[PDB]
Symmetry: D2
Subunit: 112 residues, 4 copies
């Protein structure tokens, strides 16, 4: 089974720690990048080995917000890997600059 | 512009969001024809901004999928929520991962 | 049948003109926003009434690039409408700032 | 960093791009296991940049779908192409449009 709980690191150099996840599939943690809290959920439905999930990172050094979503996989080499895609929403003043507030990208995590 | 309350959108889905603590957290329900799913998000409180940026995850109850929403609460007069989302599907093997993510838009208005 | 050929306008105020599309599904045109050329393709496969397509806009006022993709629909009210999503790639100097060069958005077009 | 040549990627697809005129246009073939599809793109020539931004459309031959790619040619030493794409599926009714677009990444390297 692929568990979210733990310490992860990615291709960009950022690290992430996730706490235990309750029965409601909920969980919290911290996102570290060269610290901000994050709160997410894991899909419990058919209680699968490779869960789908999503979390929000409330940036504490700016008024932007990032949301990641992806799946917890057991790689071919037998290792746990998190494939995720995110949307980074920056804040704009007029509802007219809104068309450019959203960036999109990816991030692959592996256990620390 | 506060997230608390009742919203609906262009597709025709309703969303209910409760109070948000001093840390910006909040919970709510997501309704779409119908099935209700829990929602857990957070709003950026960095600058006590009147048009706060925010994000939340909808944990689907009728599927093994997940959907994340990010956006900003704009005072159009009326309060409008402009969002963009990512819909992650669950695939059996890491080989198909590439085709598992849909992206799209959604404008919410006070129900 | 929903044709790409013609003059369109969108929700953002930008206008667009598309030329005839050959048998290879190819076509060119111009994108006007408050002028840059664009070159695209339309999917011919099962020669459908509501084609799928994609085009690139070679910005002539900056070194960024935008690509749109979507489908040509016959709306319920009987009108032609183009639902599209785009990616706007801005250019960065170091392959390390790459994680933030891509923005994503939407654009709905209707005939002028 | 020029697009002309032969590239392959992480998924394992090959792409061949021909010469690009003075306007930045170019054509090529897209191979994926196998089926070959034509590609038509353009590269930004605004600043005679050595690491040009670019975009192109792949007109699928075995489906009614379309895929657009945008990105930048980076000199990693080696020439690398970092791209992001949108895969549009064709739906019968404008009602399902919302679920018709997939997004993803792709890193190309000189084959
Ligand atoms: O500089 C900005 O544009 C705003 C700061 C955004 C915070 C870092 C972002 S979140 C998505 C991405 N993944 C990651 O690990 N770092 C970046
Ligand atoms: O039917 C499926 O494709 C799987 C269930 C998907 C859940 C509904 C999606 S989430 C993004 C989109 N916005 C919205 O309000 N409803 C749809
Ligand atoms: O200011 C920038 O960030 C670079 C200029 C980008 C050009 C305008 C973009 S293309 C996608 C979007 N659709 C539209 O009609 N106008 C915008
Ligand atoms: O099988 C399908 O889902 C429809 C055909 C899709 C065409 C292949 C897609 S395009 C984006 C992605 N990158 C890549 O190199 N191959 C895939
Ligand atoms: C995070 O991962 C470990 C924890 O110390 C370490 O290898 C690395 O320096 C850390 N990097 C960041 C950006 O926190
Ligand atoms: C929810 O929104 C309103 C509630 O006032 C209702 O009329 C509508 O039918 C509902 N839609 C869904 C999908 O539940
Ligand atoms: C484009 O559409 C028509 C053409 O004149 C007109 O209504 C409008 O002013 C034009 N706007 C732009 C930005 O070109
Ligand atoms: C294309 O790339 C190389 C060509 O040298 C070949 O070995 C590989 O099998 C080919 N892959 C596909 C999908 O055609």
């Amino acid at each position: 089974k692929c568990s979210l709980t733990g310490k992860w690191t990615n291709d960009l150099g950022s690290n992430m720690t996730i706490g235990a996840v309750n029965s409601r599939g909920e969980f919290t943690g911290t996102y570290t990048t060269a610290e901000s809290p994050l709160h997410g959920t894991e899909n419990t439905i058919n209680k699968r080995t490779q869960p789908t999930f999503g979390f929000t990172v409330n940036w504490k050094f700016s008024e932007s917000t990032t949301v990641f979503t992806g799946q917890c996989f057991i790689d071919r080499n037998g290792k746990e890997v998190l494939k995720t895609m995110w949307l980074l929403r920056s804040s704009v003043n007029d509802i007219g600059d809104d068309w450019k507030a959203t960036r999109v990208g990816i991030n692959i995590f592996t256990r620390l």
